[PDB]
Amino acid sequence: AIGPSANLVVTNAAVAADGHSRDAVVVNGGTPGPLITGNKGDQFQLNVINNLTNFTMLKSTSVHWHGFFQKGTNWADGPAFVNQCPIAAGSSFLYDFSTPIQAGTFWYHSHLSTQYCDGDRGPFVVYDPNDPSANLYDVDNLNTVITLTDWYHTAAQNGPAKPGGADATLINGQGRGPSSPSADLAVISVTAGKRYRFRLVSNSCDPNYTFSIDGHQMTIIQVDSINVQPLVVLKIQIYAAQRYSFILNANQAVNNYWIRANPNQGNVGFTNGINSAILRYSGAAATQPTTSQTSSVQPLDQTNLHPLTATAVPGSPVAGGVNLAINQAFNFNGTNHFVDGASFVPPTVPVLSQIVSGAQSAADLLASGLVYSLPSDANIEISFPATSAAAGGPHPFHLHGHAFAVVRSAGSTTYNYNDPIFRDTVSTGTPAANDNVTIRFKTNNPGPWFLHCHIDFHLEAGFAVVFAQDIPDVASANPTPNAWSDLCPVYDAASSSSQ
Ligand SMILES: CC(=O)N[C@@H]1[C@@H](O)[C@H](O)[C@@H](CO)O[C@@H]1O
Ligand SMILES: CC(=O)N[C@@H]1[C@@H](O)[C@H](O)[C@@H](CO)O[C@@H]1O
Ligand SMILES: *[C@H]1O[C@H](CO)[C@@H](O)[C@H](O)[C@@H]1O
Ligand SMILES: [Cu+2]
Ligand SMILES: [Cu+2]
Numbered sequence: 001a002i003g004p005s006a007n008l009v010v011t012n013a014a015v016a017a018d019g020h021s022r023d024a025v026v027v028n029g030g031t032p033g034p035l036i037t038g039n040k041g042d043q044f045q046l047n048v049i050n051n052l053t054n055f056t057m058l059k060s061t062s063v064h065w066h067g068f069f070q071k072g073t074n075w076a077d078g079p080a081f082v083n084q085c086p087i088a089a090g091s092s093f094l095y096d097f098s099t100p101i102q103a104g105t106f107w108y109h110s111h112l113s114t115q116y117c118d119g120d121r122g123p124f125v126v127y128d129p130n131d132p133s134a135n136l137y138d139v140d141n142l143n144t145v146i147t148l149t150d151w152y153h154t155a156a157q158n159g160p161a162k163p164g165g166a167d168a169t170l171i172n173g174q175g176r177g178p179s180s181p182s183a184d185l186a187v188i189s190v191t192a193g194k195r196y197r198f199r200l201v202s203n204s205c206d207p208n209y210t211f212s213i214d215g216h217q218m219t220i221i222q223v224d225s226i227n228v229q230p231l232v233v234l235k236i237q238i239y240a241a242q243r244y245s246f247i248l249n250a251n252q253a254v255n256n257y258w259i260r261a262n263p264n265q266g267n268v269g270f271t272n273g274i275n276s277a278i279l280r281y282s283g284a285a286a287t288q289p290t291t292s293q294t295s296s297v298q299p300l301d302q303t304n305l306h307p308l309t310a311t312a313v314p315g316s317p318v319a320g321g322v323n324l325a326i327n328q329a330f331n332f333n334g335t336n337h338f339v340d341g342a343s344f345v346p347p348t349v350p351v352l353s354q355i356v357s358g359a360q361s362a363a364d365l366l367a368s369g370l371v372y373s374l375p376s377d378a379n380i381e382i383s384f385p386a387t388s389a390a391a392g393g394p395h396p397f398h399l400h401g402h403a404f405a406v407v408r409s410a411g412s413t414t415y416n417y418n419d420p421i422f423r424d425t426v427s428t429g430t431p432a433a434n435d436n437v438t439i440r441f442k443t444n445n446p447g448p449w450f451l452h453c454h455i456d457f458h459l460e461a462g463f464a465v466v467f468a469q470d471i472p473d474v475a476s477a478n479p480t481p482n483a484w485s486d487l488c489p490v491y492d493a494a495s496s497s498s499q
């Protein structure tokens, strides 16, 4: 609800998310942060105020607006040392950008190191006054957004480098156990007979969830901010950073129903209402559900998602039928992730500043072996063949600045150049299934753009490349405000323990 223009004050505070108390990074007093809203066409002016004091979770910050294209505003994209230097403690920085052509469910999170795990993360929804699916539901507001969070009792920079499971799943900021199975659960209210556009966002740093609601079907109308043909499911497997709008018809008996969100790892199952929340019909008692889980007969399959209005796949309906095709060979050496033999090490000068100060190709750009230049107005094919060489499957890869066509999904051997879904975060599957997840996009948006695994622990360990798209037009297409130009000198001046 906090309108198109708002202050985002970022501070440290103790939080009892799951009944356990620990210090964390919070936005306007709480984590996950407040929900940001606006309408398609709005100008978003988000003043991020860095009042952090704690070095262990990082005093500096940078916020990424997940799903937004940032066309002409690459500087505002967020990723530290790619699009900006971090905001320094005590200073504030304005993120100013328009959204003329996008509408849907989004989110925002720190894009400095693993900071967002320590709770710089929250939802962001842009409503469409002319939404094509508006006639399919009665209710769509703050109370229809559902966030999922993997919550850790030990801080990001304090625990294991690859945690492999959270202590508690949070649904709408609340969750349980297993050393605190009496903590408050989230309650979501429905009125029997009404239809709801529930906007599901994974704010997750790592795990994926099998999401379901006892006794109810779900009609998917949106995937990663892309309007989608109505698809009836009863189980959604949602990977880190992904979004779905589904319509729930409140057509069951007035009762309490278990909302379930089962992690792929960590504390699995539902003993004592862990990984759980409550769907409560108006009139039903303020108690826990007694509903029992049924087998998922219609699970979400990504190859069944198709865009609402026909949307052509870049290039031509043949393998390699594009201007530039790139394969991403994954690797891991015990502590570091490698793409095509290179592990991402953030440079001192943000890639953006390097281009504006007049780098011409990948060879002029630091983080060498990690930047790929892309020509403008071209079709691009990326493939991410799954391999045992990189531990921690399935890896959800995310592309900044673009939505892409998923011509080949995980768990499928078919290539769809006709009508596959477009999105911005995609599971790259498992080596065991011989997956070769393949995506396509159009270079219509000049600037440096991150492509990385949206398991934040893996990004931190270098699992990243940068697409330097249309270098010639970067500086001129992305004019930067002095506040942005000031960011680096101020941050670079800082002592190490004030970072
Ligand atoms: C009593 C003790 O061991 N203290 C530490 C605390 O310093 C640290 O902040 C936390 C990690 O988030 O773990 C532990 O509680
Ligand atoms: C930045 C740097 O020097 N890191 C390397 C890293 O690439 C490599 O994975 C490791 C061996 O496992 O040795 C070093 O620490
Ligand atoms: C599948 O992805 C690409 C296809 O372009 C191949 O080159 C690779 O070998 C993988 O198996
Ligand atoms: Cu993101
Ligand atoms: Cu993003």
Ligand SMILES: [Cu+2]
Pocket (backbone or CB within 6 Å): 392, 394, 395, 396, 453, 454, 455, 458, 459, 463
């Ligand atoms: Cu990963």
Ligand SMILES: [Cu+2]
Pocket (backbone or CB within 6 Å): 064, 079, 111, 398, 400, 450, 452
């Ligand atoms: Cu990113």
